[PDB]
Amino acid sequence: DFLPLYFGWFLTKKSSETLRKAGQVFLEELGNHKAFKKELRHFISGEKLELVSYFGKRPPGVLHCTTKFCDYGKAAGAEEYAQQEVVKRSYGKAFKLSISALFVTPKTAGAQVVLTDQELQLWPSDPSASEGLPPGSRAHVTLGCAADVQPAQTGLDLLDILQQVKGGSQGEAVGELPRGKLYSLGKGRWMLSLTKKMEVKAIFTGYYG
Numbered sequence: 001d002f003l004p005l006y007f008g009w010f011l012t013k014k015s016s017e018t019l020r021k022a023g024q025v026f027l028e029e030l031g032n033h034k035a036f037k038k039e040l041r042h043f044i045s046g047e048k049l050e051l052v053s054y055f056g057k058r059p060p061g062v063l064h065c066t067t068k069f070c071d072y073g074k075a076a077g078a079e080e081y082a083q084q085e086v087v088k089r090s091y092g093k094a095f096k097l098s099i100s101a102l103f104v105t106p107k108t109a110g111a112q113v114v115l116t117d118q119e120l121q122l123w124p125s126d127p128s129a130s131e132g133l134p135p136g137s138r139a140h141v142t143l144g145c146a147a148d149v150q151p152a153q154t155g156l157d158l159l160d161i162l163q164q165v166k167g168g169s170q171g172e173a174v175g176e177l178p179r180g181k182l183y184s185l186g187k188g189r190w191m192l193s194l195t196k197k198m199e200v201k202a203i204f205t206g207y208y209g
């Protein structure tokens with residue numbers, strides 16, 4: 001028996017619509033915000049940019065939070081991850097995920113997930129960007145990416161942003177949005193720290209493509 005393309009928590013229809021819309025609104029507010037317009041120079045090499053279109057490659061339907069990319073067993077650690085009891089036991093089970101913030105970079109747009117310890121048991125254990133950052137920090141839901149961005153980039157961007165946060169490089173909020181504080185981290189990187197964390201319902205399972 002061969003494994004799925006990847007495991008992860010797949011959000012319900014309602015939760016997907018909720019998070020997707022939040023993302024959409026965020027991209028609109030950020031693109032319309034004076035602080036972002038002022039930094040367009042550091043966002044793209046080549047006025048006003050429409051972020052919703054910039055992140056043109058979007059998830060077509062149900063949003064998800066990936067745990068372990070398996071590539072049908074070809075990826076390193078896939079077989080080992082799939083055979084775990086906690087993965088087999090948690091298969092088809094319902095979980096609540098906690099979104100702590102929404103972020104944007106020149107490459108990707110996504111939402112940061114804060115996994116509970118229970119959920120962390122489903123996080124694989126096998127990057128340099130993960131130095132100092134606790135396991136699971138990479139957890140996220142991708143909302144979009146630029147034309148020529150490869151998979152797995154959103155997680156790498158999130159870790160990079162969480163790294164700057166680690167060293168108190170967040171910086172004073174450059175603005176306020178209805179959902180929370182807006183932070184400019186430089187190099188086209190932006191983070192909205194939500195005043196109230198968003199809770200989404202999701203089913204843990206494998207996607208076979």
Ligand SMILES: Nc1ncnc2c1ncn2[C@@H]1O[C@H](CO)[C@@H](O)[C@H]1OP(=O)(O)S
Pocket residue numbers: 006066068069141142150151152153154155
């Ligand atoms: N090493 C990887 N290669 C391809 N996709 C990966 C990898 N690691 C995690 N993923 C994720 O698995 C899903 C299908 O590609 C996507 O969610 C990929 O992550 P994203 O950052 O959301 S594009």
Ligand SMILES: [Cl-]
Pocket residue numbers: 130134135136137138139
């Ligand atoms: Cl991690």
